[PDB]
Structure formats: C-alpha cells, structure tokens
Write a protein that binds this ligand. Structure first.
Ligand SMILES: *C/C=C(C)/C=C/C=C(C)/C=C/C1=C(C)CCCC1(C)C
Length: 227
C-alpha cells in the first residue's frame, strides 16, 4: 500500500518497542515489590502500543467509514490500544497517590466510556452525529482530568514531597497531552478532515510516545515508586 503516514507508524512502533524493552529490563532487575508493580504496569503500556502500531503499520486497524460524501480512512486499532493503555496510565497515577478503590473504579469506568464513545463516533456514518459521540467522550475525559487535578493532587499531599512532586509532573504531562487528543480528532480524519491523515498520524505518534514512554521514563526513574 505505502500510505503517506506509514513512516509515522514505523517510528511509533520503533519508539514504543524500545521503550518497552528498556522498561522491561529495568523492571526485572528490581527487587522492591511496589517498584515491581509500577514497572509491570508501565512496561505493559508501550508493549500494547507497540503491537497496535505494528499492526497498523502492517495494514490492520484501518477501516473506511463513509460520511461527508467520502470514504474516510479511520484507524480503529488506536482505540484497541488506548482502551487498555489509558486505563493503565490512570492506575499508575492512582497507585501513586494511594487513591481509593472507588476512585480507581470510577476513573477507569469513565475512561472506558471515553474510549468507547470515541470509537463509536469514529465509526458513525451520520456526520453531525460523529460529533455528538465525540462530545460525550470529551466530557468523560474532562471528568477524568478534573479528578486527577482536584482529587489526586489533594491525596498526593498525604505523600512525601518526593511522591507529591513526581505525581505533579506526571499529572501535568497527562493533563497537557490528553487535552490534545480531542482537538487532533476534531480537526483531523475522524472529524472536520482539515488536517490530513499523514500529519494526523504524526501528531498522534508524538502524543502517544510522550504520554507512554515520556510518562514511564519520568515515573520509573523516580524513587516515589518504592514501597
Ligand atoms: C497512550 C495513549 C494515551 C495517553 C491516550 C490518550 C487519549 C485520549 C485522552 C483520548 C481522547 C479522545 C477524546 C476526548 C474524544 C474523541 C476521541 C478520543 C478517544 C481521541
């Protein structure tokens, strides 16, 4: 096929793969129990991303959805990735501030809605309706970020500054990166079709890589992960 975005898919596969191996290697040398539990969660994130980027690179996860009078190329393998990666990231942050089970359950549940309605909207054939679903998915995300900002930041205050400081950074990187996804979707292939797929893939690989390997590097190199 040789689609114009393939280069970005290969670069995302490459980065996720390398990020996975370094986390894996670093994680299996650690003896601390708690450290092992962030290391296992954080390594799995780029591992899943790698498989999905690889599949997309190889021609899967792509579907032609009709709307706007066009046959639009929608990469659905992305949500198969994010459904597990976003929730895992959320768990990492939750375990960091000692978030309560109810919180974790509610956060992960909201996250399922976000990704679920997101895909439904990326698959919807009525143009305007695609934006109705997108709207509900973004609302779900804003709920998630509100909790991370108001809830979590508050509980990280019962933590040592080292843990409170690591969380702030991960929280900040998360709020900034996640905020970007809905806008990429809106102006790109799933939405207005303003930004082309090849450029859109580039924007998504940058956010994905940053949000996973960027996030993991920061978290795994911190002492806040120790029991
Ligand atoms: C590794 C992947 C990460 C951290 C992905 C984060 C993805 C989001 C915050 C996605 C959000 C979306 C919306 C708010 C609405 C429309 C569709 C999505 C799924 C792109």
């Amino acid at each position: 096929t040789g689609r114009p975005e393939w280069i970005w898919l290969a670069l995302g596969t490459a980065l996720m793969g390398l990020g996975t191996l370094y986390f894996l290697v670093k994680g299996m040398g650690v003896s601390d129990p708690d450290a092992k539990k962030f290391y296992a969660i954080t390594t799995l994130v780029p591992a899943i991303a790698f498989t999905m980027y690889l599949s997309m690179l190889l021609g899967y996860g792509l579907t032609m959805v009709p709307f706007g009078g066009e046959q639009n190329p929608i990469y659905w393998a992305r949500y198969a990735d994010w459904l597990f990666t976003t929730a895992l990231l959320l768990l990492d942050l939750a375990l960091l501030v000692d978030a309560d089970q109810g919180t974790i359950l509610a956060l992960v549940g909201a996250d399922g809605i976000m990704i679920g309605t997101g895909l439904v909207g990326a698959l919807t054939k009525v143009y305007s309706y695609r934006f109705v679903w997108w709207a509900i998915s973004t609302a779900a995300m804003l709920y998630i970020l509100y909790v991370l900002f108001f809830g979590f930041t508050s509980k990280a205050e019962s933590m040592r500054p080292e843990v409170a400081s690591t969380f702030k950074v991960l929280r900040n990187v998360t709020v900034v990166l996640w905020s970007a996804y809905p806008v990429v979707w809106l102006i790109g292939s799933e939405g207005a079709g303003i930004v082309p797929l090849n450029i859109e893939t580039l924007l998504f690989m940058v956010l994905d890589v940053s949000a996973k390997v960027g996030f993991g590097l920061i978290l795994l190199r911190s002492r806040a992960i120790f029991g």
